[PDB]
RNA sequence: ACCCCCGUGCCCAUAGCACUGUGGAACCACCCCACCCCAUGCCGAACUGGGUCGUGAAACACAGCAGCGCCAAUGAUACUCGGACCGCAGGGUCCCGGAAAAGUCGGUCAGCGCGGGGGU
RNA sequence: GUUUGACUGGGGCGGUCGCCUCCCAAAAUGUAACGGAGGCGCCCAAAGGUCACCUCAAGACGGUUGGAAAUCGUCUGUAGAGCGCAAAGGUAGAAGGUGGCUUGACUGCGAGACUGACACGUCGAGCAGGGAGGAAACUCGGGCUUAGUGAACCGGUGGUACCGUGUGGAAGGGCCAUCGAUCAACGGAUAAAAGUUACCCCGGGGAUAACAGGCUGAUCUCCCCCGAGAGUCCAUAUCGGCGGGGAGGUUUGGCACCUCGAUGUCGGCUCGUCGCAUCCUGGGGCUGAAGAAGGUCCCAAGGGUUGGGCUGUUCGCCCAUUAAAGCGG
RNA sequence: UAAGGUAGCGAAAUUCCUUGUCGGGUAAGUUCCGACCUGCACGAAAGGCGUAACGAUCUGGGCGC
RNA sequence: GGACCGAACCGGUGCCUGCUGAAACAGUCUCGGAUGAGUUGUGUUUAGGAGUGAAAAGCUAACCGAACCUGGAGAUAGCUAGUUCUCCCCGAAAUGUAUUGAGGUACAGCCUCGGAUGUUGACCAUGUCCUGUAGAGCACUCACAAGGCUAAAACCUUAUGAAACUCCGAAGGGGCACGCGUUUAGUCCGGGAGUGAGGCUGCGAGAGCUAACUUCCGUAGCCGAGAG
């Protein structure tokens, strides 16, 4: 009635204004606190990862619906 | 006792198997799927064993 | 007194109270000055004193309420299994929080009734009539 | 160039709801019919296929309006990085920057593209 | 001949040992407790691929069985539902509810990243072979995610034709699939194992219990505030509900600080000495104090405080006395 | 559960509650004797209940000193 | 006559004394047996997991739950002690995960040395992004105070509590860039380690009495190894 618990690191991993290489993981989350943006892909656990290299950037609108996205260099 | 056993499927005249746990509840009738074996393209693997 | 409710046990610390610094109901009000827990029978003794002095008349409101469980380990054991399942319910009380307030009783009799009730509370406390008020 | 309609985006409640008024032969809408393309675990109600008329009834479009939502200051306070203290203790104070939540004043019933249709 | 786990506010008994979710966790991640709550050791040939369609809880009014909730109809209706199991995130342009065809619940790979001491664990664009659904863009290498698990060794089975001891074979082995783990003490000592010692031994520990001391003071002992009533009448002569505040450190305890290369423990005897919260004596106030005999509070620690029966007893009960037969260090 | 104590004895070298309750003894008896039974958890050859005599045995009383 | 009293003799009951003794088991006093299952001499036989034993695990050459001597043998010792000449430079750990593991050990972390790069380090500023704590608030869940309406539920006014509530939500904190500006480390490679028992205080919590020179985490500093 006490002994139990468990430890699974989660969170944003690549924050806005950072230069991700493509295939980088940018957020680990359990649901859709972030929705995959333009240039972003989301795997089974709703991880968001770079589709192509660029500047990571965040779009915030109402915390029901914000999105991570890539603005490529060049 | 035991319920949903592990079932190996011989490919249709191939040489390779696939193995998966077809539940023995509703899946009373032997498995017949399709899969790519040793040779050609997808063919009928008969999960009898 | 005891609530009919939810999770058995809790924690504890403090900061000055917000949820009732002003006397809405009634005329006069006794009011806490110190941050103790108040809990159950302490209040109920306040209630039974004031109801003796006043009843057949007056309106008695108890704006405070024994929300918070508090625990006692058994008897005499070592720091052992878990915490102790029961013991008494309390109400945290921060200064400016209003516990009591009478209605339909003359100023002086409310003085004497607040005096009796406050002679059995862990905190010292001050009474007041309601100034001008807002918050509606 | 002015007007309005049909689509369609950016922005997605300061742009939403309620009460109200205005539109029909441009446009949209209801509407008529349906054995069949097609279709409802029953019903052409909805998908669907052929078309007037009629009617803007409902819908939709536009306009009014601040009852409701939504936005939301200033003053101050809560709390607090940092600095220095008090109380035996629960707990409290001071200087220095940071600074809410709520609530009051007020603000709104949007704003900005692309096209195509029809008016003048 | 051996085995007979560990944690553990001493050890034992009890409980626990891997994995998931929330709080603790101090707005990054991480963070302990025999802290506070709850679940897993599965499930689903469709609850999966895809492709098409539908939208929930709840309430009100109205209606055959009904009579609060069934079924049907209108109205309101960011979700108050649902999501196979727990909880959390997420979710209505669905991940929810229903039908069509289907197996990608694929083979060979893996840019680049999350996470871990390691070994593990997670996500993943994109390339080929070959498929599935869609008219198409395109989606598919199991499931809305997060638990449903087990290194290695040793072996069962099916392929493959690497090895194979003079040579050609074969026996045997290897490579690819795959079967065997409450090895749950869940990084798993052997394939294989329980007790007892007061007959006990060794190495160690004040890293850790029993005595005592220390720190604390819940429990213990004692004093104070209020004043409900009792006291015929009057709260306070005496008593004082329900409640509040303190002191002491003599009780049982918590904690584990010096002492385990030793601080001898109950009771008696002997010898003392100290506190005072005073049993007697001495002085005072008040009394529900006429006298006498008392009650209770204040001052007071000079001295005094008996002999026996029972019991190891300390206590306590009793006998017979007493001014008194005090309580503690 | 295969059954559930026949005689005997019982607060006992066994009894926890306990100094059980009554009585005897004593001025006074947590011990000891006798009764009772409510036997925490007596009992028939790990023998039950008695028993004269014996005992550097253990327990309680008395006289003498 | 496994009868009585009682010397010798065999014994060892109770008290004292002795306790660096007269003595490594005794002395005085007292006491048991004393024709018997008795006492005693010489010779001789049984021994080490073995003998013997009217049975204590007794005795087996002054300490027997398995004798002594030599040998294997310097057994093994996650345990305790001890480990010696000088000055100079740097300088820790008492954390993490794993362990028939818990006072042991492996890996990492932190120390030092040599090589390589050669400002990538540190602080503080601006820009940007992330977060749900302090506070606050009742919009949901649970709890909850006085009224109203009412077949009590819902619903209206007034009014609160929250670790496992959140319409909101700071100060701070973390990543990245840049240096717009000061400083001086950083990283990679290879040799040698030790540490893995920590302690106190302030702030933030849990367990505990909002007890402890209490206990378990977080964070800053000192002790540890710091004299003045
Ligand atoms: C007095 C008689 C003997 O002592 C004891 O019995 C006992 C003495 C102590 C009190 C005791 O300590 C106690 O231990 C406890 C476990 C702990 C306790 N702590 C708390 C302090 C401690 O106090 C012991 C272990 C200490 C230790 C040094 C020891 O072993 C001493 C041994 C012998 O010398 C003594 C004798 O004096 C020898 O007398 C012998 O008596 C025979 C009958 C004679 O034939 C003769 O033998 C020929 C003679 O001589 C040998
Ligand atoms: Mg406070
Ligand atoms: Mg404050
Ligand atoms: Mg308020
Ligand atoms: Mg339009
Ligand atoms: Mg209208
Ligand atoms: Mg016209
Ligand atoms: Mg129609
Ligand atoms: Mg109209
Ligand atoms: Mg301001
Ligand atoms: Mg400052
Ligand atoms: Mg400060
Ligand atoms: Mg300030
Ligand atoms: Mg505001
Ligand atoms: Mg409008
Ligand atoms: Mg236009
Ligand atoms: Mg051996
Ligand atoms: Mg152990
Ligand atoms: Mg348990
Ligand atoms: Mg965190
Ligand atoms: Mg933090
Ligand atoms: Mg830790
Ligand atoms: Mg707790
Ligand atoms: Mg769907
Ligand atoms: Mg096709
Ligand atoms: Mg792919
Ligand atoms: Mg084989
Ligand atoms: Mg050959
Ligand atoms: Mg072969
Ligand atoms: Mg383990
Ligand atoms: Mg094994
Ligand atoms: Mg075993
Ligand atoms: Mg014995
Ligand atoms: Mg012995
Ligand atoms: Mg020893
Ligand atoms: Mg030592
Ligand atoms: Mg110690
Ligand atoms: Mg230890
Ligand atoms: Mg001792
Ligand atoms: Mg004790
Ligand atoms: Mg002690
Ligand atoms: Mg001492
Ligand atoms: Mg008290
Ligand atoms: Mg003590
Ligand atoms: Mg300690
Ligand atoms: Mg010594
Ligand atoms: Mg002792
Ligand atoms: Mg005095
Ligand atoms: Mg007197
Ligand atoms: Mg008199
Ligand atoms: Mg006496
Ligand atoms: Mg006598
Ligand atoms: Mg004395
Ligand atoms: Mg008797
Ligand atoms: Mg007895
Ligand atoms: Mg008598
Ligand atoms: Mg008697
Ligand atoms: Mg006796
Ligand atoms: Mg008797
Ligand atoms: Mg018997
Ligand atoms: Mg027998
Ligand atoms: Mg016999
Ligand atoms: Mg007998
Ligand atoms: Mg004899
Ligand atoms: Mg005797
Ligand atoms: Mg006698
Ligand atoms: Mg004879
Ligand atoms: Mg003899
Ligand atoms: Mg002799
Ligand atoms: Mg004789
Ligand atoms: Mg004789
Ligand atoms: Mg033998
Ligand atoms: Mg000997
Ligand atoms: Mg000799
Ligand atoms: Mg030996
Ligand atoms: Mg040696
Ligand atoms: Mg050897
Ligand atoms: Mg050994
Ligand atoms: Mg130095
Ligand atoms: Mg692990
Ligand atoms: Mg260790
Ligand atoms: Mg190392
Ligand atoms: Mg170097
Ligand atoms: Mg760097
Ligand atoms: Mg730099
Ligand atoms: Mg708060
Ligand atoms: Mg608002
Ligand atoms: Mg520079
Ligand atoms: Mg190295
Ligand atoms: Mg060296
Ligand atoms: Mg440690
Ligand atoms: Mg520590
Ligand atoms: Mg507590
Ligand atoms: Mg400590
Ligand atoms: Mg040290
Ligand atoms: Mg110093
Ligand atoms: Mg230092
Ligand atoms: Mg000094």
UniProtKB/Swiss-Prot annotation, chain A:
One of its GO terms (cellular component) is cytosolic large ribosomal subunit. One of its GO terms (molecular function) is tRNA binding. GO terms for biological process: translation. The keyword Repeat does not apply. Keywords: Ribonucleoprotein, Ribosomal protein, RNA-binding, rRNA-binding, tRNA-binding. It comes from the Bacteria. Part of the 50S ribosomal subunit. Contacts protein L18. Binds the 5S and 23S rRNAs and also the tRNA in the P site. Belongs to the bacterial ribosomal protein bL27 family. This is Large ribosomal subunit protein bL27. The chain holds residues 12 to 85 of 91 of the full protein.
UniProtKB/Swiss-Prot annotation, chain B:
GO terms for biological process: translation. Keywords: Ribonucleoprotein, Ribosomal protein, RNA-binding, rRNA-binding, tRNA-binding. InterPro entries: Ribosomal_bL33 (IPR001705), Ribosomal_bL33_CS (IPR018264), Ribosomal_bL33_sf (IPR038584), Ribosomal_zn-bd (IPR011332). GO terms for molecular function: rRNA binding; structural constituent of ribosome; tRNA binding. PROSITE patterns: RIBOSOMAL_L33. GO terms for cellular component: cytosolic large ribosomal subunit. Pfam families: Ribosomal_L33 (PF00471). Part of the 50S ribosomal subunit. Contacts protein L35. Belongs to the bacterial ribosomal protein bL33 family. NCBIfam families: PRK00595.1, rpmG_bact. PANTHER family: 54S RIBOSOMAL PROTEIN L39, MITOCHONDRIAL (PTHR15238), LARGE RIBOSOMAL SUBUNIT PROTEIN BL33M (PTHR15238:SF1). HAMAP family: Ribosomal_bL33. Binds the 23S rRNA and the E site tRNA. This is Large ribosomal subunit protein bL33. The gene is rpmG.
UniProtKB/Swiss-Prot annotation, chain C:
Pfam families: Ribosomal_L16. Gene3D superfamilies: Ribosomal protein L10e/L16. One of its GO terms (biological process) is translation. One of its GO terms (molecular function) is rRNA binding. CDD domains: Ribosomal_L16_L10e. Keywords: Ribonucleoprotein, Ribosomal protein, RNA-binding, rRNA-binding, tRNA-binding. One of its GO terms (cellular component) is cytosolic large ribosomal subunit. It comes from the Bacteria. Binds the 5S and 23S rRNAs and is also seen to make contacts with the A and P site tRNAs. Interacts with A site tRNA mimics, and is probably one of the key factors, along with a helix of the 23S rRNA, in positioning tRNA stems in the peptidyl-transferase center. Part of the 50S ribosomal subunit. Contacts the CTC protein (RL25). Belongs to the universal ribosomal protein uL16 family. This is Large ribosomal subunit protein uL16. The gene is rplP.
